[PDB]
Every structure is written in C-alpha cells, then in structure tokens.
Amino acid sequence: IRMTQSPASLSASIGDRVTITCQASQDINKYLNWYQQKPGKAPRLLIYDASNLETGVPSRFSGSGSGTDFTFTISSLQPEDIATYYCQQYDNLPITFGQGTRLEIKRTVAAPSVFIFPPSDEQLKSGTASVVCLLNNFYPREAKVQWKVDNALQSGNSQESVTEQDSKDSTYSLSSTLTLSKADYEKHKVYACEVTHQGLSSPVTKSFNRGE
Amino acid sequence: EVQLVESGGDLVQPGGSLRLSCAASGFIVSRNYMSWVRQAPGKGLEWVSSIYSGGSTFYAGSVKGRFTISRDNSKNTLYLQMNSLRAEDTAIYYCARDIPRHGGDSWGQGTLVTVSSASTKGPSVFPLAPSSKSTSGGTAALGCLVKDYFPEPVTVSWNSGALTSGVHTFPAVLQSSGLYSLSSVVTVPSSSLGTQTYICNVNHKPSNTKVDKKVEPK
Amino acid sequence: EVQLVESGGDLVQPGGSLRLSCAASGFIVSRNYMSWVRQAPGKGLEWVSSIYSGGSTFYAGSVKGRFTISRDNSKNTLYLQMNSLRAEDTAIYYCARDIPRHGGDSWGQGTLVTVSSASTKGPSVFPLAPSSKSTSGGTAALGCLVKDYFPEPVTVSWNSGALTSGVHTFPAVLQSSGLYSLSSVVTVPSSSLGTQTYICNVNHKPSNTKVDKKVEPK
Amino acid sequence: NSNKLDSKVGGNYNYRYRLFRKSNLKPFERDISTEIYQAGNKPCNGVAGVNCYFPLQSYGFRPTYGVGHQPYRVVVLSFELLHAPATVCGPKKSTNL
C-alpha cells in the first residue's frame, strides 16, 4: 500500500493541539497501528487498530479512521513528546510503513554561549590540525555560519553537525570541524569563527594566542 | 518485561552471510507472531520477514531467496540468517513480536548492520583540554574528541557513567576519508576542575577498543 | 582514437573466478576480429583466446575449459570470464582488436592479474628527507620511499603531477617477506627547497590507499 | 459475494475464524474448540488477561466496508473415487424412438 503521511515539519508551542494524517491507497479497514519512535530508543506502539490506545500510555493520544484516510491527534503537547510517529498496516502481506512526521517544540530565543578549542601539540607534531568552534543553546537549527580564508569567501571545506532537540530545555548545540595538514598549519596563524544569531547583539569575536 | 537483546551482526564484505539472533522475556518465540523490520539510516522502516505461530514464513520482494527466517524453540532466539548480502542492505534491524489483533508489542533496541568493503580502523583520541580563556565567574566547558573511527557505534562516557548532566554527544558525520568523527562536551562548575578528575571513555564494540583518556585543565 | 580501458581484475584466491571487460572507441565489438593476448612478467606474449565477426570462439591449450570469451553488443565491453584459475596465471592481459589482413590495430594498455593466496597489506611510507651533506653549489636530490606494499601496481607522483623532470622510479623487487618495495627520487635545484613544498603521493589502487607525505629538507 | 444476506450494519458477529493455533491444520482436518492461547508459562485459568486470549475472532462484516471485507460464501466440491462400485454418475440425455 502507498501509505502517505502529509505533515513532516509541524511545530507547535507548549501545550497545543496538533493532528497527523496517514492516508492509504485501498481499504485497510481499521488495521493501521500508530507508532512513536524517540531518538535512538526503539519505537513504541500507541494506537493499535486505529481506534484503541494501549493501556499505560498517557491519555492524550487519540486516533480514528476507517477505509483509506486515517488521522492521529495529540491532546496536550507535553515537552517530553518529541519523536517521530509512524503508521503501519499489518494485514496486507506487503506490510508498508509510512514516512514519519518529525515533531518538534517551539519557544522563545536564547543567548548562545560560544566556546572554541585549540589543536593539541601531539596532533600538530603528527602532521595534521583540528580547529573546532562550538555553539550551544541557540534558536534555531538554521543560522548563518561562515569562514574567512585570507579575507576571501570560503566554501566546500566546512562541516557542521546539529544535536537533536533536547526534551526538557529545547536547546541546540553546534560544532564545526576544520582540518589542515602540517605544511598549511605551520604557514597560517590567524583563524576566526564568527556566527550571527537571531538575537540582536554585538557579533561574537573569538581570539586566541599560540603561546598560551 | 519483554526486553529483547537482539544483538548480532556487525560487518562483512559484500556477498557474505551474517546470522542474527533475537531474544525473549515473558513469552516463547514459537507461540506468538514475530517479524523483523528494517530501518535504513534516515529512511522509513521497511518490512523484511515475518513468522507465524505454526511455521509459516513470508518475505519481502527485495529479500526473496537471499534472506531466510528460522524459529528456535530451545532458547527463544528467533534467528534470521542473512545470506547473499550486498552494499545497500546497511540498516538497523529490530526484532519484533506482534500479537496480531489484541494489541501488545515488543520492539527490541535492535542491532546495526553496515556491511561494506572497507576495513576496520581504530579511533584517534585527542585531548580537548579547556583553554585558560574560560570565564572566571561563569561556567566552563571541556570535552573529549574522537576522530577517524570505523564502524559505528561509538559511546562516550564521563567518570565511568557517573556524570550525565550537560553531556552533549554530536551525531557522527561522514568525512571525505570514509571515517567517522564525533565530539563530546560537558558543562561542569569550575570549582571541581582542580578537585575532581575528568576522564573520557571512547568505546568501539566491533574492534573491542578500550581507550581511556584523562583530561585536566591546563 | 581507438583507445581501450580494458581494466578489470586485480586478485583472488586460487580457484576463483574473475571477469575482465574491454572497451571501444571508433568501432563495434561484434563486427571486427578481436582477441586477448597474455604477457607473463618477463616472458614472451602468449595467445589465450580470440573471437570472430560471427561468434566463433577459439582458445589456447592451457585454457581449454577454464577460460571463456563472450562478446557484448550493447556496450562494446568484450568480456572474458576467467574461471578455474590457478597460481601460474599471473600475467598482464591486453585487450586487442585485430583487423585480419588490411592491417590496423588497437592494443589497449592492458590490466594486471596477480592471483595468489597471500593477503593485501598496505604500504609503509617513510621519509627520505635530504641530508645536510648535499652540495651547496651543486644540485641536491630528495625523494620518497615506499616499503612493504602488496599488490602491484603503485604510482608515485610529485606536486600532484606538476613535476616530471628528474623523476626516477625504480622497478619493484621481491623481498624475502613476499612484499614489494620501490624507491622514487627526483633532482631539483636547491633554490626551491625552502620556497617550494615537495610532497610524495603513493597510490595503491587495489586497496584504495591514499597516502600523501610532505617532505622538507632538514 | 453474499453481501446482502450475511451483512449486519452492526456487524454479524456470528461468523468467526481462528486467529492462533500451535500447528498448521492437516488436510481436510476439522477443528472446533474454545481453549485459551497463552504467551507466558502461566496456565492463566481461562481469563482475558496478559498472555491470555480467546482464539476465535469475528469478521465484523458490515455493509459500509469495501469489496475486501464482504462475505464470500465458498463451496469446495471434491470428487472421491474408491475401489467400491461408483454410484454417483451423470443427465445422459438420449434420442427419440
């Protein structure tokens, strides 16, 4: 079955009413289960048969449907509700899941704390360097990050990794990895990592000395 | 408790044969419906195989004749014999008991299969010693960097698991060299820097690499 | 241009089955006479198989029933399926189009087959940094040493191919350990020693080993 | 498609199938029972509880359902031939005298 879930980026504030819609290509009657997969941890079964919530669940999740189109509802959006929910049909032999609807939480902005680490002496003497500038507790995952090489625009040499949204404080962490070899490290001594956040403030300037 | 340690597999060359094993707490494997889902990294879960309560086997189209399923009465251990593998089977495999209509479930934590051609190379552990520019009256941060490890997974522990507050492990990202990297940082009060000793522990299960690095502010 | 990239094969255990592929620029494989010669290292070329313009196959005495030939209309790619191999088939294989009497030819660069029992082990790269005893008013020499690599071939490049003058790559010689070695040296003016950075690049195609070593006078 | 006769808007709970049995039925076997099916070792004393279930389950046939879930009466005619003389022959129509 060509299972279809229509909301993939849906973001509501604390304590709101949202709805997920899983749609099928035939009559699956009522045999469609709703799953909840937290990051890393194994999926949980929330509404079996499309009309029965399993005991022990909190009592906010409700679902109702029949034949092709099914809907999933969330009655109270507690902060510890961030996950990806899947719809499964378990009686047609080609059991096909759905795409998932990654749910997130929305809140005000926060002032980020920026730290940067210098390369260690052992790695520098072993012919390679690693420069990492760290960004923590910022909103959102999307931000303007740039690098400056000889006062020229730099691209194709940077990488970033964003930590998954925290369940209780809803903060983000970012890291940028830069790698160079001994010949290029020994000839170039100014490096800077500058990021502009949504909160209007003075741009962050990071400076470090080699001796200390 | 229906808790499953379905833990078998780590990786082989293309064309190899791996053997998974599942396991079982309240029930017997041969009496209840069970199946094996397959979650590719960053993709929707897909259904590979399923067993019934009387030995009926059903497979998926992509695994017709390469995969086998088999049920073990003696020790639970629902077995899934992966054969005729390839370079696109890399996915996390979860053991799963499905009672068909009355509703309960077990999905066990599941195991990672990354089957490829490259060779296993140990992690490169580097010290993030905190710099002297940290805030005197604020809270300082320091962490442990692990570079060029293969394959997944890698776990970073601090103070042998005694410290969970402020732990931020960044997800692995693929470098140009085909080797993975991650960065782990923690936020701790500066008062415990000179009086509490912080040590990072990188873990590599496939190669049994046990590297412990002690970190001190400079 | 009739240029051929007949590049397939690197090596297997004794009793394996490799598959060669040839390729084609001005003509179609199934219309012209083609054959496969075999050059053992340091020995006269010997003739293995030959195809005709209507599908006739002829083999050599030593390859009766172990070797197969096959012609592919769809993508050129004259295919030669090596089966039932052994430990004396190690030779360089050249794809070859022979127009029978009117005279033209294509012999493509050809591919190496070294089929054996040993395992692949990466090269050991060592720095030849030039000594201070080099002539002050003359021309100094410095180069990059590669030791204990397997199997062939290995290519050494300087300045990413920008420097060809004075390049001297010594042919590989078999050591007592079964691993190959080579030495590459170049002759450059001493005026560019402190102002031009010289880097050696060892290449191992079978294991995809990409090692770059930067060399500086001491 | 016996849609009209066997469909109850409420559902016709009198048509049922066996969800679970330990072994596949032998050819032409007939099996009729109410016995609890467990997952745990507990005998469970025949109650509806964890690892305790009623094996028959209804088809819930209801008219506003699709073609897939609609009653379909099945008649499996078989032909048995033994060494005893045959007694079920076939109309054998004739010609005028």
C153 prior amide bond cis, ω within 30: yes
Resolution in A: 2.7
Experimental method: cryo-EM
Residue B79 contacts D, CB cutoff 8 Å: no
Rounded CA-CA distance B26/A121 in Å is 55
Residue C211's DSSP bridge partners are: C202
Q: Are strands A101-106 and A9-13 parallel, antiparallel or unpaired?
A: parallel
Measured in angstroms, the CA of D18 and the nearest CA of chain B are apart by: 12
Mode of pairing for the β-strands spanning A152-153 and B34-39: unpaired
H helical segments located in chain B: none
Distances (CA, A) of D91 to B19, C137, D88, D94, D95: 63, 122, 11, 9, 13
Contact B138, B130 (CB under 8 A): no
Cβ-based contacts under 8 A for chains A and B: 95
Residues 6+ apart with CB under 8 A from C83: C17, C66, C67, C68
Phi, psi of B49 (to 5 degrees): -155, 165
CB C12 within 8 A of CB C26: no
Task: Read off the DSSP letter of residue A94.
Answer: S
**Residue B162, SS3?**
coil
Measured from the Cβ of residue D9, the count of other Cβ atoms closer than 10 Å reads 8
* CB-CB contact of A20 with A5 (8 Å): yes
B52-61: long-range contacts at Cβ-Cβ below 8 A with a sequence spacing of 24 or more? B53/D20, B53/D21, B53/D22, B54/D21, B54/D22, B54/D23, B54/D24, B55/D24, B56/D24, B58/A93, B60/A94, B61/A94
CA distances from C52 to C37, C70, C78, C79, C109 (A): 15, 11, 12, 14, 22
Chain A CB contacts of C197 under 8 Å are 183
Single-letter residue type at A189: K
**Which three-class secondary structure state does DSSP give residue C13?**
coil
Phi and psi at residue A79, to the nearest 5°: -60, -30
Contact call for residues B158 and B200 (beta carbons, < 8 A)? yes
- Read off the tokens for B121: 């190379």
From CA D35, how far away is CA D54, in angstroms rounded? 7
Structure tokens at B162: 């005694």
Q: D39 vs B54: CB contact, 8 Å cut-off?
A: no
Could you say which DSSP state residue B31 is in? Answer: G
CA-CA distance, D37 to B54, in Å (whole number)? 13
Give the burial string for B71-99 (b: 16+ CB within 10 Å, else e).
Answer: beeeebbbbbebeebeeebbbbbbbbbbb
CA-based radius of gyration for chain B: 22
| A43 to B107: CB separation less than 8 angstroms, yes or no | yes
**Based on C-alpha coordinates, what's the Rg of chain D?**
22
Q: Using alpha carbons only, what angle is made at residue C130 by residues C125 and C135, rounded to the nearest 5 degrees?
A: 160
Those residues whose C-beta lies under 8 Å from the C-beta of residue A195, and which sit 6 or more positions away, are A112, A114, A133, A135, A143, A144, A145, A146, A204
Helix (H, G, I), strand (E, B) or coil at B24: coil
Give dist(CA C54, CA D92) in Å, integer. 65
The residue type found at C175 is: Q
Contact A51, A28 (CB under 8 A): no
Which burial class, exposed, middle or buried, applies to C26 when counting CB atoms under 10 A from its CB (0-12, 13-18, 19+)?
Answer: exposed
Instruction: Kindly list the partner chains of chain B, i.e. chains with 3 or more CB atom pairs below 8 Å.
Output: A, D
- As a whole number of angstroms, the distance between CA D3 and CA D21 comes to 29
Euclidean distance between CA atoms A79 and A13, whole angstroms: 9
What is the three-class DSSP state of A123? helix
Q: Who contacts D65 (Cβ-Cβ below 8 Å, separation ≥6)?
A: A27, A29, D7
Nearest-CA neighbor of A28 among A99, A100, A98, A88? Answer: A88
Q: Buried (b) or exposed (e) across B205-218, using 16+ Cβ within 10 A?
A: ebeeeeeeeebeee
Give the H/E segment covering residue A210. Answer: none
Nearest CA among B45, B44, B49, B27 for reference residue B99: B27
Closest CA to C13 of C140, C142, C153, C116: C116
Of B34, B133, B146, which to mutate for an interface test with A (greatest number of A Cβ within 10 Å)? B133
Closest chain D residue to the Cα of A31, Cα to Cα:
D69
> Alpha-carbon distance D30 to D8, whole Å?
27
Contact A45 B105 (CB under 8 A): yes
B99, B54 Cβ separation under 8 angstroms:
no
Asked if B42 reaches chain A (Cβ–Cβ under 8 Å), the answer is no
Using the CB atoms, write b or e for C61-97: b if 16+ within 10 Å. eebeeebbbebeeeebbbbbebeebeeebbbbbbbbb
| A130 phi, psi to nearest 5 deg | -135, 120
Q: Could you tell me where the DSSP H helices lie in chain A? A: 121-124, 182-185
Residues linked to residue A45 through DSSP beta bridges, in sequence order: A35
